[PDB]
Write a protein that binds this ligand. Sequence first.
Ligand SMILES: NC(=[NH2+])NCCC[C@H](N)C(=O)O
Lengths: 290, 285
Amino acid sequence: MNPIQLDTLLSIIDEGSFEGASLALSISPSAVSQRVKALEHHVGRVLVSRTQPAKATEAGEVLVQAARKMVLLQAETKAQLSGRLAEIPLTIAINADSLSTWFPPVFNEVASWGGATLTLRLEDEAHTLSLLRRGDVLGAVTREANPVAGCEVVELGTMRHLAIATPSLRDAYMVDGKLDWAAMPVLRFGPKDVLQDRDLDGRVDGPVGRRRVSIVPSAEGFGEAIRRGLGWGLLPETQAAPMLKAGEVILLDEIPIDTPMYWQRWRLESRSLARLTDAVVDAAIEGLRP
Amino acid sequence: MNPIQLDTLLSIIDEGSFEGASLALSISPSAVSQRVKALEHHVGRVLVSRTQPAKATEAGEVLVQAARKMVLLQAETKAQLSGRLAEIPLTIAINADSLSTWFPPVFNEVASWGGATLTLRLEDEAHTLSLLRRGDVLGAVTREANPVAGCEVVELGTMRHLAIATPSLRDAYMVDGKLDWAAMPVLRFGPKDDLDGRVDGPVGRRRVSIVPSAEGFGEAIRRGLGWGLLPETQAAPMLKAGEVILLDEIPIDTPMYWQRWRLESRSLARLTDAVVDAAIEGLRP
Ligand SMILES: NC(=[NH2+])NCCC[C@H](N)C(=O)O
């Protein structure tokens, strides 16, 4: 049954006449009658008297009672929703390399809103977009530039990786003035690492023999293992700058690997989301290259 | 909040996809998407997944529960006009320990209502609350006192568990006049299911049997396979028959609650009375 008609019937009783419901609802007296007749025709029963003060019939008393029940439900739901939104964390898919460099400043902005919470899911660039598409996150950092259906994209800047190692490690694999890339132990970030898979492209020509690999599945532990000579690795220039400045590591190579990054968020008129987006863009501007 | 849009979101979930809602509602696929977009802009959150099967987000669960509440009201109203008994299915989450002790008397009451059905779901504590939140059950017996969004809570009383074993089993694990709790085989209802204040230091490995039914769990203790924590209601006959003894004068007490949708529902009110009355008759204060 049409709940607007139920409301119309209720207004008639609460206000006492058809004209009273008309003025209360800001609808014509004709509209009230149309709704009542429809509801009565839908039910198969006469529901209310056309006299004044208006009295509900036996069947009509049912719908009036029902209408007040639905009115109470609607009000309780609105209040319940308002409170749950506050409690529910905004969900983001992000990669470890963004989280370990330029992103943490976003935390400051969310903290100042007063009660907001974040849920970060750590995913590589490719996997990140699927979480957005399916709706499991409201925003996502991704290498993919084309917008997924329902979402808008903003460019954040470019992430640069450097091939770094400790000076001692490099010298250990210098022979005849040329570096033996294949023999040099390398750091890998996970058992699935796309970067470390293609880390010799344009450094070695033919088929590569077997490598010496250590795996450290945290951005900071990964950097520490390189920092400490366990292997060379591809490290975000943000992370490498202090080690290079302190002379703990050196550049093995003037050839960076560049990855443009984007922010994708569901299109919704949410000021919460708008604020989060601005915070992300602003953080990436400060910690990525133009 | 537009009530038509709530129906559409619910249809997406019930039918499993946006296309399913399209066919179910006789509206274009574009209309389904437009209605969701509008509803999402009103809330400020994504409400349902764009995958199949469609799942409500955390925010979406609020609206889905609300939509199912409205469906229940509509059904009770239709039943009142009809001049015939309602025949409304009531879906409940319950724990095995309640179902096997104090709950069954509810069956008599529900049966007497004419036409109505029960769908009981036996669920662990965590999933039980999730079902309530998203609207997959309208009521639940639970150890959780804090109300899930959209629900009201009623205290039912306290469930007492006793640590029991057969005399022969206890004697078998007496060592120098002291019982070796860690070495004694124990019963468990599942792989996710007890020595706190029974052992001080580090616990070694245990020997565990798993029996995933309340009565077989009890039967295994009764028959010496292991000790276990058993509801005093279940244990009383075994204790009276001398089949088991108390390993411990300290019971473990668990307060119980009834959580129900906040709704002016005559079915829900009636079910609550039946549940509360059963708990009054078979649980401790
Ligand atoms: N060899 C490496 N440096 N691998 C880094 C993998 C980190 C991954 N791209 C992420 O940001 O989540």
